Design an enzyme around this catalytic site. Structure first.
Site, mmCIF file in Angstrom:
data_model
loop_
_atom_site.group_PDB
_atom_site.id
_atom_site.type_symbol
_atom_site.label_atom_id
_atom_site.label_comp_id
_atom_site.label_asym_id
_atom_site.label_seq_id
_atom_site.Cartn_x
_atom_site.Cartn_y
_atom_site.Cartn_z
ATOM 1 N N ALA A 189 0.608 -9.362 3.592
ATOM 2 C CA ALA A 189 0.562 -7.908 3.788
ATOM 3 C C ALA A 189 -0.851 -7.478 4.211
ATOM 4 O O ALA A 189 -1.806 -8.248 4.125
ATOM 5 C CB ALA A 189 1.017 -7.139 2.530
ATOM 6 N N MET A 190 -0.966 -6.224 4.669
ATOM 7 C CA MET A 190 -2.203 -5.674 5.248
ATOM 8 C C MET A 190 -2.269 -4.190 4.952
ATOM 9 O O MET A 190 -1.328 -3.455 5.270
ATOM 10 C CB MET A 190 -2.261 -5.834 6.777
ATOM 11 C CG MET A 190 -3.652 -5.593 7.445
ATOM 12 S SD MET A 190 -5.120 -6.000 6.497
ATOM 13 C CE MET A 190 -6.189 -4.568 6.790
ATOM 14 N N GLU A 191 -3.411 -3.738 4.437
ATOM 15 C CA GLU A 191 -3.517 -2.424 3.819
ATOM 16 C C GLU A 191 -3.825 -1.289 4.791
ATOM 17 O O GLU A 191 -4.466 -0.318 4.367
ATOM 18 C CB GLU A 191 -4.588 -2.457 2.736
ATOM 19 C CG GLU A 191 -6.021 -2.671 3.227
ATOM 20 C CD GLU A 191 -6.472 -4.133 3.255
ATOM 21 O OE1 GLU A 191 -5.637 -5.078 3.221
ATOM 22 O OE2 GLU A 191 -7.706 -4.335 3.225
ATOM 23 N N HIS A 193 -1.219 -4.577 -4.898
ATOM 24 C CA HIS A 193 -2.427 -5.066 -4.235
ATOM 25 C C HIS A 193 -2.782 -4.191 -3.039
ATOM 26 O O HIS A 193 -3.940 -3.780 -2.865
ATOM 27 C CB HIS A 193 -2.192 -6.502 -3.771
ATOM 28 C CG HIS A 193 -3.380 -7.165 -3.135
ATOM 29 N ND1 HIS A 193 -4.323 -7.857 -3.864
ATOM 30 C CD2 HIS A 193 -3.808 -7.190 -1.848
ATOM 31 C CE1 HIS A 193 -5.235 -8.348 -3.041
ATOM 32 N NE2 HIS A 193 -4.947 -7.950 -1.814
ATOM 33 N N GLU A 194 -1.798 -3.908 -2.185
ATOM 34 C CA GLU A 194 -2.071 -3.137 -0.974
ATOM 35 C C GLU A 194 -2.430 -1.700 -1.310
ATOM 36 O O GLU A 194 -3.259 -1.085 -0.629
ATOM 37 C CB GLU A 194 -0.868 -3.175 -0.017
ATOM 38 C CG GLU A 194 -0.480 -4.581 0.328
ATOM 39 C CD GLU A 194 -1.564 -5.276 1.117
ATOM 40 O OE1 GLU A 194 -2.217 -4.619 1.968
ATOM 41 O OE2 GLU A 194 -1.822 -6.466 0.812
#
EC number: 3.4.11.2
Lengths: 904, 900
Positions: free
Chosen positions: A289-291, A324-325
Site C-alpha cells: 500500500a501507499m499513503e 499503517h496508511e
C-alpha cells in the site's frame, strides 16, 4: 563529471518550487506500435532563491515536444525584465535530470514558470504513471494509476522530485467519457467534455495542500465504490473492481477506515485536514500500500476481504495495513522526512502507530502483543550484522534512487517501530502522545530530521513530576537512532553483575561502521523476581555495573525486559537459565506469554552467536509440549527455521523432524479436541493462529493424523470444487500438503483453480501451495510461468520465486533460475523497493558451505556488469550471513544431531 | 632424457628376480607396507652413461653411498662406476648417472632394496580388506596395468620391453602366496623368523611387466582340470567358496580356455590358470598371465540370489579375460596407442567364448547394444579419437589410462566384428592363428595383422574383397568416427559422410582419407536378401539395389554387422514404419533396434526431423522382444536427460506409460502373476525392462507389486521373496515411494551383504530417494571407506547423479571433493572419466555450460588427468545439447502430447 551540478544526485538549493499545474491524458488502448502511452503538460512555478544560470529539474523516461528548438519554455511571472533566454536544454539520463541552460542568471527573489509538453509510457512496471489490468467476464480491462514513492513522480512529469521541496499541485485529467478520474482532492466541479474530442472528458481537481511530490496520485478506471462519512465528516470511499465491490469485498475496509482515521486525529490532537480519504485496491501494485494524501492505494490483498473465504490472517492484514496508511497521514504527509536517510521518521512511526489504530479497530484481537514477533524479532536478525545500518544513516550515504529504494527495509520499518515502542513504554504513552502532538503542530506542512523530535518530548517530561529519566531524551534516543545494532544484556545472578555489548551474530565479523558512542546504550530494564515485579532499572552507557536487583539465591530467578518492551537481548548465567526452565516445566503460566517467547527467541539468537551453548536454546523448547499459546510456539518455529535452513539438506534433518513431530503432536491433538474434530474453530485471533501453527507444523513433520485430515479435506474439495469445504485458516496447509503428497494431477487442479481465482486472498493461497511440489520438472515448469505476465503478474513474481526456494528441492532450481534470468529480473526490480532485496535474501538463506560461499562470490563476479541495485546491501548481508552459517554449521552440526537424537 | 615420458631404447632387459614381503599389519608409522629386493638383468644395446628405469612411490635402502648397485655380468675390465642416482618423480624414473658409458653388447645387473605402501589405492602392490565373522582380514594383491608395476619394484615398465620374471614371496606362514606360475617347490620357513614362509615361483614366460601378479591371502578355492589338462582354480573369500559361489566359474573357465586354444589353433602354454575374486578392485577384471583377477561381482555367482544378468556378466568377463591370454599376453601391443589390439580383440572374442559356454542364450546378438551402440555416442564427436591414435598423443600415464575407453574396447570390438563378418569367421580365425604363431612372445603393430589376414584370404577363391585388407581396414583404424550411409530409394543414390552429432562440431583432427570409408553393405528388399555391395572410398554412388518402386522398401546393414548409420528418404522410412505396424516380424529383431537407434542419432544431428525418430517408437506397444525395446529406452534416455527437468517430461512419461503398459500386462500373464519367469535369457531381459519401465513411469500395478513385495520382505528380512531379476526395480521403486524407514533398511542390508551381486542392487537402489537430505547423507557416506569401498565410489556417485534430485547434489559434491577424487582416480582408468561423463550429461543450458567452463578452469592447475578427453567431450556435448533443446523442445512436447 561530479564537478558539474547535473551529474550529482541531489538537486541544487538554488530554485524552490511553490506550485505545479499538471494535465495528464492516459491512452488505455495500445498504439500502432503496441505501446500504452500517456501525454501531458505541466507548469512549475518556482522562486529563485540564489542567482543561477541553470534550471536542474528531475525527468525520467519522458519524451518532450520541442517548442523553439527547446524542450521547455521559461518566463518570469508577470513579465518583468530581464526575461530568461534558453540557450539549450538537455536530458541527463543517469541523474534523471532535465537541464535548462540559460544565457543570463535568474534573478534572486523573483518567480518563474516553466511549461513542458511531454509523453511517457503507461508501462506495466508499477512505477510512476502506469497501467494495471484485470479480467471482467470475457473482457480485458486496462486502467491508469500512479505510484510515485520514492523517486517516480519525475517519471510522470518534470518536477523538483525531493521530499523537502513541498508544493501545491493543480491536477487535470483528460480521460474517456465512460471512465472516472480520481486524485488526491475532490474535483473542482463536474467533468465537462474535452473540446478537442467529445468522446473524452476533462476532470479538474482542487488544489492539494502543501505536500511532497512522492504523495501525488491520479487514477483513471471503471471502478466502483462504497461510501460512508466518518463521525468527523471526512468522506470515506472504498474503490475496487466492480465485481469485488458488488460482492461486498470492500465492506470491511469501509467499517474500519473512518473510525481509525478519527482515532488518530483525536489521539494526536491534530485533525485530518482534507475533506475525504479514498482507499483504492489495485490489481497491479509493487508495495502492498501507499499513503498518497487523500487517495491511499492498496494491493487488493491488503484492502479487500471476503467474510466467507478470506482467512483470519487476511483480515488482520487489512486492518493493520489500513491503520499503517492512515498513520502516514500524520507521519509522512503532514510532517515529512527531510531526506530518505531518515525514512524511519515516516515508516517507523507508521509501523508503531499502526498497532494503536488497528487495536482501536479490533480490541478483542490483542494485536499490540504481536508487535514483538512481527517487528522486533523481524529486524533483530538483520540488525545483528556488521552490515546493518542505523535508523538515521548519514545522508551522503543514501544518494541514488537505488540506495533510496534500498532503505525501505526492516530497519526503517520494524526497528523504527521497536524503538518508538520502547520510548513510548518508558515515557508512558499519555506523555509520548503529548510530545508528538507538539512535534506535529510545530512542523505541519514542513520537514524534520531525527533531532527535532526530542526537544518536544523533553519538555513534556520536564513539565510533570511523575515520569523522570536518568538522562535527557536526546542522550538516550541518539544511541538508538544514530548507531546500528542493539546490545545483549548479560546478568550474573550470583553477583548481580549486569553488562552490555553490541550483539553480533558472528563474533568474528568486523564492524567497520564507527559509532560516536562506542556501541554502548542507555538501556531501560524492567524485571521480575520469581514472578513478582521489581523496581525499574536503567543501565547507563557503561560496559558493566552491579545491582542486587539482579542477584538471586537458590530459590529465586530473575527475568529481564517483561513484554520485551526494550530493544535488546538478555542472557543469564547457566544457573538462572535452569531455574527459568524448571519454572516453564513446573508452571509455565508464571512467566508472561511474551516472555516465554523471549526466552526461546533470545536463547536461539545467543546460541547462533557462541554466547550460549546450542543445547540451551534447544532445552528451552522442551516445555512447548505443554504450551498451547500462539506466541511462544511462533517464536520457536521462527527460531527453528534457521535450523531448518541450515540442516534440511543434511543428516541432521531426520532427527530434527522427529523432535518437532514429538513436540507438536499434543498441540495438534489438543486442537482436534477443542475444535470438535476441526468443525468448531477457536474464538480468539491468538488461538486461531495457534491452531494454524499446530496444523501446519504437524503436517509438515509427519503427524499421520494431520496428514489424514489434509488428505480427506482435499479429496472432498476435489469431488465438487464449486463448494470449498476447507476452512480458510487451513487452506494453505491443506493445499500445500495435497500437492506435496500428490503429483501432476493435484498440481494441475490447483493451478486451474488459481487461474480462475477472483479473490486475491484465495489466489495467493493456491499460488503458494503450488510451490510445494516434490517434482523437479513441475517446479521448473512453474518457474517458467513466472516469466509470463499472462500467468503470474509482475507484482507476484518475487513472492513466487521465494516460495519455491523455500522448498528444499526448489533451492537449487531457484538459485539457477535467478542467475539464468538475471538481466530480466534486474530490469524489472533492481531499482524498486522490497522485491529485489527480498529475492536476494530468500535465495541465499540456506548457504552454509565453503562451496556455496564460493558460488555466491562467483555470482557477484558474474553480475558485476549490472551491479545489484536496490539489493546491494542485501547482497553484503548475504555474504556476511553465509560466512557465519558456514562456521556455525561446522561447530554445531554434531552437538545438534546428538541433542535431537537424545531428546526425541 | 629423464624428462621425456618414453624410455630410451639403449638398454633392453632380459630377466628379473623380485622378492616381495607384504606386511598385513601396520608398522610403527601406522602404514601397511611391503619390502622388497629385485635384480634387473639387461643388455646395453647402445653405449650410454645413464640407466633410466621406472620407479614410483618406492623408498630405497642405499648401499655403499648409492640407492642401487650396478654389476657387469662378466664385465671385469672396468666395472661401471655410479656417480649419482636420483628419483625423477614427474616422469616416474630412477636415473643412475655413470662415470663412463656402459659397453655395447655387455650385460648388466642392477640390484635394489626398497619399500612401498600397501595402500588402499587399487594400484600396484596394494591391500584389500574384508570382514569374516567379527575379524577384519587384510590381504595383499596386485594390479599393474597400465603403468603400476613400477610402483612395486623398479623396472623398464613399457609393454614392448618383455622379460622373464623370477618371483619370490615372503609371507606369514598361515597364508598362501600365488603368482603367475606355480611354486617351484614347497614353501620353506623364513630362517630369520619361522612365523613367515618363503614361496618361490617358476620362471614366467617372456611377457610384459603389466601382466605380473602376486597375492598373499587366506583364500579358499575350488579346483578342476580342463579337458586339455590345464589346472583351473577359482579363489575367493572362504565364506564365498564354501557357499558354492565359485562353482559356476569352475564350470565354464576350463571349457572356454580350451575353446580358444582350439579355435585359434594356438595352445595355452601354462600349466594352470587361476581365477581369483578380490574384495577391492578398480577394473572389474585383469588378465594377468596365469593369475586372472576379478571383482567379486564379475566372478562369483549365487544360484539362489544372483540375477540372470549377473550370470551373463560372469561368463562374459571370464571369456574376455581368457581371450586376453592370446590377445595381449602371448601377443602384445607395441604401445598403448594401439590398445584395441588387446581389448578390441578381447571385447569381440569374449562373445565367441561365452557363446560356446552358454549357446542357448544367443549372446552374440547383444554385441550391437552392448558395444556398437555404446561407443557410437562418443565416436560421433569431434573430440573422439581413432582406434590407432598417433602415439605422441598417448604419452603420460594419465593419457595411457584414459585410452582404456569405449573406443579401444567397443569400437575395437565393432570393427573386428565387421571384419569377421565380411570375410567369414572361419577365414578370420585362420589368419589370426597365423598372426599368433608368428608374433608369439613379442609385440605387434596393426600392419602385422593385415598381412596374415591377407594371406588367408589370398589362399581361397570364394571370399573376394574390393581392395587389400590393409587398405580397407586402415579407414576404420586410422581415422576416427564412422559414416552415415544415406539412400535415396527414388534413384538408388547412396552417399557417405562423416557422422557428427552436432553439424557444427569443428573437426580439427585431419584424416589422410578425408573421412571416407570403404563400406561393406548388406541389404534386403522387403525381407528377402539382395546381393552384397561395397561402397568404395567415394562420397557418392548409384546402384539399383537401393532403388525401389511404390510397393517396395529396402533396409541396409542386416543385423548391424557394419560400423555405420543408415538414413533413407522419407518415403522409405514411411514404408518401414508401415511394415512395423502391419507385421513387425518381417524386419529382423536387430534391425528393428537399428531403425529406432539410427533415427534417434540422425534426429539429434539434423538429418531427420525428431518426429521421425519418435514415430519409429510407436510400434513398440506391440513388441515383446528385448532388443528393440532396449534400443528405444537407451535412445530415449537422452530425451530424459534433456527433458526430465522441464515441462516436456509430463507428456513424455505419459507416452512411455502408454507404450509399456501392455508389455507389463503381457508379462504379468505369461509369468502367472510373477511366479514363473521366462525360460529364455532374452525374454528374461525383456521382462526386466518391462517391470523397470512400468515402475519408472507410473504404471500403478507395477508400483503396487514393488511396494507390496518390499513391505513383505522388510517384515521378514530372513526371507527375501523378490526374484533376483526384479530386485533392482523393486528396491528402487519402494525407496522412491517410501521414506527414511525404507532407505535405512536397505542401507543396513547393504552394510551386511556378503554377496556383492546383492550389495550392488541394494547400493544402487539407495540412489532412488526423493529426499535431498537422504541423498546428501548418502553422499557423505561415500567419503568413508568403512562404508563405501573406494572401488564403488564413482559407481555410487553416478547412480545418485542419475536421480533428477541428485543431479546438482552430485555436481556440487564432485567440485567440492575434487582433490580426493582426483588423487583416487585421476591417474587410473574407467572411474574418473566415467564420473565426468555421468555428472555432466544433463547439461543443456547456457548457465550449465558456464558452470562447466568455470569448473574446468578452477582446476586447470591440476588438470583433469585420465578424464581430460572426457571433459572436452562433455564440453562438446553440452554445446550440442544447448542447441538441440532450443531447436526441439516445442516439437517434442507436441509429439508426446498428441501421441498421449
Amino acid at each position: 563529471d561530479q564537478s558539474k551540478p547535473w551529474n550529482v544526485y541531489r538537486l541544487p538549493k538554488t530554485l524552490i518550487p511553490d506550485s505545479y499545474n499538471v494535465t495528464l491524458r492516459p491512452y488505455l488502448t495500445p498504439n500502432n506500435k503496441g505501446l500504452y502511452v500517456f501525454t501531458g503538460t505541466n507548469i512549475v512555478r518556482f522562486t529563485c532563491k540564489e542567482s543561477t544560470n541553470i534550471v536542474i529539474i528531475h525527468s525520467k523516461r519522458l519524451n518532450y515536444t520541442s517548442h523553439q528548438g527547446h524542450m521547455v519554455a521559461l518566463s518570469g511571472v508577470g513579465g518583468f525584465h530581464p526575461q530568461p533566454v534558453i540557450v539549450r536544454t538537455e536530458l541527463v539520463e543517469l541523474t534523471e535530470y532535465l537541464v535548462v541552460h540559460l544565457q543570463e542568471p535568474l534573478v534572486a527573489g523573483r518567480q518563474y514558470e516553466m511549461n513542458s509538453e511531454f509523453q511517457g509510457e503507461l508501462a506495466d512496471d508499477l512505477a510512476g504513471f502506469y497501467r494495471s489490468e484485470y479480467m471482467e467476464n470475457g473482457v480485458k480491462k486496462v486502467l491508469a494509476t500512479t505510484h510515485m514513492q520514492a523517486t517516480e513522480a519525475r517519471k510522470s512529469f518534470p518536477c523538483f522530485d525531493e521530499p523537502a521541496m513541498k508544493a501545491t499541485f493543480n491536477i487535470t485529467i483528460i480521460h474517456p467519457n465512460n471512465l472516472v478520474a480520481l486524485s488526491n482532492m475532490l474535483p473542482r466541479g463536474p467533468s465537462v467534455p474535452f473540446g478537442e474530442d467529445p468522446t473524452w472528458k476533462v476532470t479538474e481537481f482542487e488544489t492539494t495542500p502543501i505536500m511532497s511530490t512522492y504523495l501525488l496520485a491520479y487514477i483513471v478506471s471503471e471502478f466502483s465504490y462504497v461510501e460512508t462519512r466518518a463521525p468527523s465528516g471526512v468522506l470515506i470511499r472504498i474503490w475496487a473492481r466492480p465485481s469485488a465491490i458488488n460482492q461486498g469485498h470492500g465492506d470491511y475496509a469501509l467499517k474500519v477506515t473512518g473510525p481509525i482515521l478519527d482515532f488518530f486525529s483525536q489521539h494526536y490532537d491534530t485533525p485530518y485536514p482534507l475533506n475525504k480519504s479514498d482507499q483504492i485496491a489495485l490489481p497491479d501494485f509493487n508495495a502492498g500500500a501507499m499513503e498518497n494524501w487523500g487517495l491511499v492505494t492498496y494491493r487488493e490483498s491488503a484492502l479487500l476481504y471476503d467474510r466467507q473465504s478470506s482467512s483470519s490472517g487476511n483480515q488482520e492484514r487489512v486492518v493493520t495495513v489500513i491503520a499503517h496508511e492512515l498513520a502516514h497521514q500524520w507521519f509522512g504527509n503532514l510532517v515529512t522526512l527531510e531526506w530518505w536517510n531518515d525514512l524511519w521518521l515516516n515508516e517507523g512511526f507508521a509501523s508503531y502507530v499502526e498497532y494503536l489504530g488497528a487495536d482501536f479497530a479490533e480490541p478483542t484481537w490483542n494485536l499490540k502483543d504481536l508487535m514483538v514477533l512481527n517487528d522486533v524479532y523481524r529486524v533483530m536478525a538483520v540488525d545483528a550484522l556488521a552490515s546493518s545500518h542505523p535508523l538515521s544513516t548519514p545522508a551522503s550515504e543514501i544518494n541514488t534512487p537505488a540506495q533510496i529504494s534500498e532503505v525501505f527495509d526492516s530497519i526503517s520499518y520494524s526497528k523504527g517501530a521497536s524503538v518508538l515502542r520502547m520510548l513510548s513504554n518508558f515515557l508512558t504513552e499519555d506523555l509520548f502522545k503529548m510530545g508528538i502532538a507538539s512535534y506535529l503542530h510545530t512542523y505541519k506542512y514542513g520537514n524534520t530530521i531525527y533531532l527535532n523530535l526530542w526537544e518536544h518530548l523533553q519538555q513534556v517530561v520536564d513539565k510533570q513530576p511523575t515520569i523522570k529519566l536518568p538522562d535527557t531524551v536526546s542522550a538516550i534516543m541518539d544511541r538508538w537512532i544514530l548507531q546500528m545494532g542493539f546490545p545483549v544484556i548479560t546478568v550474573d545472578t550470583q553477583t548481580g553483575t549486569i553488562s552490555q555489548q553490541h550483539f553480533l551474530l558472528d563474533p568474528q565479523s568486523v564492524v567497520t561502521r564507527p559509532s560516536q558512542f562506542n556501541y554502548l546504550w542507555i538501556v531501560p530494564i524492567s524485571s521480575v523476581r520469581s514472578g513478582s515485579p521489581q523496581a525499574h532499572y536503567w543501565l547507563p552507557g557503561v560496559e558493566k555495573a552491579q545491582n542486587d536487583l539482579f542477584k538471586t539465591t537458590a530459590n529465586d530467578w530473575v527475568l529481564l525486559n517483561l513484554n520485551v518492551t526494550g530493544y535488546y537481548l538478555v542472557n543469564y548465567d547457566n544457573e538462572n537459565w535452569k531455574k527459568i526452565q524448571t519454572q516453564l516445566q513446573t508452571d509455565l503460566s508464571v512467566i508472561p506469554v511474551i516472555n516465554r517467547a523471549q526466552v526461546i527467541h533470545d536463547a536461539f539468537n545467543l546460541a547462533s552467536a557462541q554466547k550460549v551453548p546450542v543445547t540451551l536454546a534447544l532445552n528451552n523448547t522442551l516445555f512447548l509440549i505443554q504450551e498451547t499459546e500462539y506466541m511462544p510456539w511462533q517464536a520457536a518455529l521462527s527460531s527453528l527455521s534457521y535450523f531448518k535452513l541450515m540442516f534440511d539438506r543434511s543428516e541432521v534433518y531426520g532427527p530434527m523432524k522427529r523432535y518437532l513431530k514429538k513436540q507438536v503432536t499434543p498441540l495438534f491433538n489438543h486442537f482436534e479436541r477443542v475444535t470438535k474434530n476441526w468443525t468448531d474453530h477457536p474464538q480468539t485471533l491468538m488461538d486461531q493462529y495457534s491452531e494454524i501453527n499446530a496444523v501446519s507444523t504437524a503436517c509438515s513433520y509427519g503427524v499421520p493424523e494431520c496428514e489424514k485430515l489434509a488428505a480427506t479435506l482435499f479429496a472432498q474439495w476435489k469431488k465438487n470444487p464449486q463448494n470449498n469445504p476447507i476452512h480458510p485458516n487451513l487452506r494453505s496447509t491443506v493445499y500445500c500438503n495435497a500437492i506435496a503428497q500428490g503429483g501432476e494431477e493435484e498440481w494441475n487442479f490447483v493451478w486451474e483453480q488459481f487461474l480462475k481465482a477472483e479473490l486475491v486472498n484465495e489466489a495467493d493461497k493456491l499460488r503458494g501451495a503450488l510451490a510445494c511440489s516434490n517434482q523437479v520438472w513441475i517446479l521448473n515448469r512453474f518457474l517458467s510461468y513466472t516469466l509470463d505476465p499472462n500467468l503470474i503478474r509482475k507484482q507476484d513474481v518475487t513472492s513466487t520465486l521465494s516460495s519455491i526456494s523455500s522448498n528444499v528441492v526448489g533451492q537449487t532450481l531457484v538459485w539457477d533460475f535467478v542467475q539464468s534470468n538475471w538481466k530480466k529480473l534486474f530490469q524489472d526490480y533492481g531499482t524498486g523497493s522490497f522485491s529485489f532485496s527480498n529475492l536476494i535474501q530468500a535465495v541465499t538463506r540456506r548457504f552454509s558451505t565453503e562451496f556455496e560461499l564460493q558460488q555466491l562470490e562467483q555470482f557477484k563476479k558474474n553480475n558485476m556488469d549490472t551491479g545489484f541495485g536496490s539489493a546491494t546491501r542485501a547482497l553484503e548481508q548475504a555474504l556476511e550471513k553465509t560466512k557465519a552459517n558456514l562456521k556455525w554449521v561446522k561447530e554445531n552440526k554434531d552437538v545438534v544431531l546428538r541433542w535431537f537424537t537424545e531428546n526425541s
